[PDB]
Write a protein that binds this ligand. Structure first.
Ligand SMILES: Nc1ncnc2c1ncn2[C@@H]1O[C@H](COP(=O)(O)OP(=O)(O)NP(=O)(O)O)[C@@H](O)[C@H]1O
Ligand SMILES: [Mn+2]
Ligand SMILES: [Mn+2]
Lengths: 343, 20
């Protein structure tokens, strides 16, 4: 807000200086495997397994992502895993997960983050059904500020979905999974993301920019307030078919202000897409749907969260689904050491 | 209802990233 737009511009100029110093000088092997006791698996994905861990020497719990180097290789994720780690240690925002330590050994790569105990937003959304517009707006505003922050550092995030958003103690979001995140000034071409959330430009095999994230926010707001994603089917081939068509049907209960904003984000013509216009983010921020949002209070965490998760002591994992436990083997021979030398 | 068709679908569980 004029004075506030200046404060934001000046903020970001300075945060950019901090990001560059860490991006240019990354921290390496800040721990080893044996300082940690592995409690249980908090969640899994196509690539990694995150575990609740305890530091033996300090009694502190963290969340540890484990990637098998032989799998990173077969899945074509070498440069992506290196981006993930390099960006995550250089970033610093209230809504993003904190990377404490990282290290590797003969078999795996390890990233040790702050343990976010409230569960995935996914969990809570599916249990409850759908969120109310004011609840949906509370979270959308956090992601709006996060993207503004990331994009100004020349970063595309690329995997926005309820499964990658976690709920902290205060009921505020922490974005995890930087696996597709990339510092890029021009266009980029990798087919990557999650089916329902893919912008039509990715599907179409076109170069894309930071607008993919804004499309993803349209998909996320729709899913949080309807309780289902705008484009769904049984097979991925059917969702893509739907994405590219461009036809969105809103539930009757969405406000006209909500439908207006989503038509602006779920804009198939990246030219007309909000967040990619001359004004950028201020289009989304000054939308009538966010007229009540005090962007500063949300940034400062001064707003009372609509939902607070309950826990009963540390390592308390009740907010997460249960997963089958795998034993993690470390080979007697170093696997793919050349490809991961900077990690 | 659309909620009904979605709840009966194949993709109502945690959705993993594309890799293939
Ligand atoms: N810091 C964290 N605290 C608690 N749980 C976390 C944390 N980071 C990740 N997790 C959980 O572990 C799951 C898998 O982590 P993620 O980083 O998404 O793995 P991935 O293999 O990159 N997944 P994807 O690429 O989305 O298929 C997440 O969905 C969260 O449920
Ligand atoms: Mn993920
Ligand atoms: Mn991922």
């Amino acid at each position: 807000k004029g004075s506030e737009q200046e404060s934001v511009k000046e903020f970001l100029a300075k945060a950019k200086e901090d990001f560059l110093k860490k991006w240019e000088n990354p921290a390496q092997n800040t721990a080893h495997l044996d300082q940690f006791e592995r409690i249980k698996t908090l969640g899994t994905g196509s690539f990694g397994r995150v575990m609740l861990v305890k530091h033996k020497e300090t009694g502190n719990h963290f969340a540890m992502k484990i990637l098998d180097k032989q799998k990173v290789v077969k899945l074509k994720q070498i440069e992506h895993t290196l981006n993930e780690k390099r960006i995550l240690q250089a970033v610093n925002f209230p809504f993003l997960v904190k990377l404490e330590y990282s290290f590797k050994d003969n078999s795996n790569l390890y990233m040790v983050m702050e343990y976010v105990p409230g569960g995935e937003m996914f969990s809570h959304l599916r249990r409850i059904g759908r969120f109310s517009e004011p609840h949906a707006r509370f979270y959308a505003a956090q992601i709006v500020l996060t993207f503004e922050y990331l994009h100004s550092l020349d970063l595309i995030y690329r995997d926005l979905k309820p499964e990658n958003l976690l709920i902290d103690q205060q009921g505020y979001i922490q974005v995890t999974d930087f696996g597709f995140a990339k510092r890029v000034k021009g266009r980029t071409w990798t087919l990557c993301g999650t089916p329902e959330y893919l912008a039509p430009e990715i599907i179409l095999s076109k170069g894309y920019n930071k607008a993919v994230d804004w499309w993803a926010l349209g998909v996320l707001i729709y899913e949080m307030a309807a309780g289902y994603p705008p484009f769904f089917a049984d097979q991925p081939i059917q969702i893509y078919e739907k994405i590219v068509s461009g036809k969105v049907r809103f539930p009757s209960h969405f406000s006209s202000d909500l439908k207006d904003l989503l038509r602006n984000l779920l804009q198939v013509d990246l030219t007309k897409r909000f967040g990619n216009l001359k004004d950028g983010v201020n289009d989304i921020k000054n939308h009538k749907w966010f007229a009540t949002t005090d962007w500063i209070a949300i940034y400062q965490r001064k707003v009372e969260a609509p939902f607070i998760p309950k826990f009963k002591g540390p390592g308390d994992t009740s907010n997460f689904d249960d997963y089958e436990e795998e034993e993690i083997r470390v080979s007697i021979n170093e696997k793919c050491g050349k490809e991961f030398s900077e990690f | 209802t659309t909620y009904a068709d979605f709840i009966a679908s194949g993709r109502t569980g945690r959705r993993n990233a594309i890799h293939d």
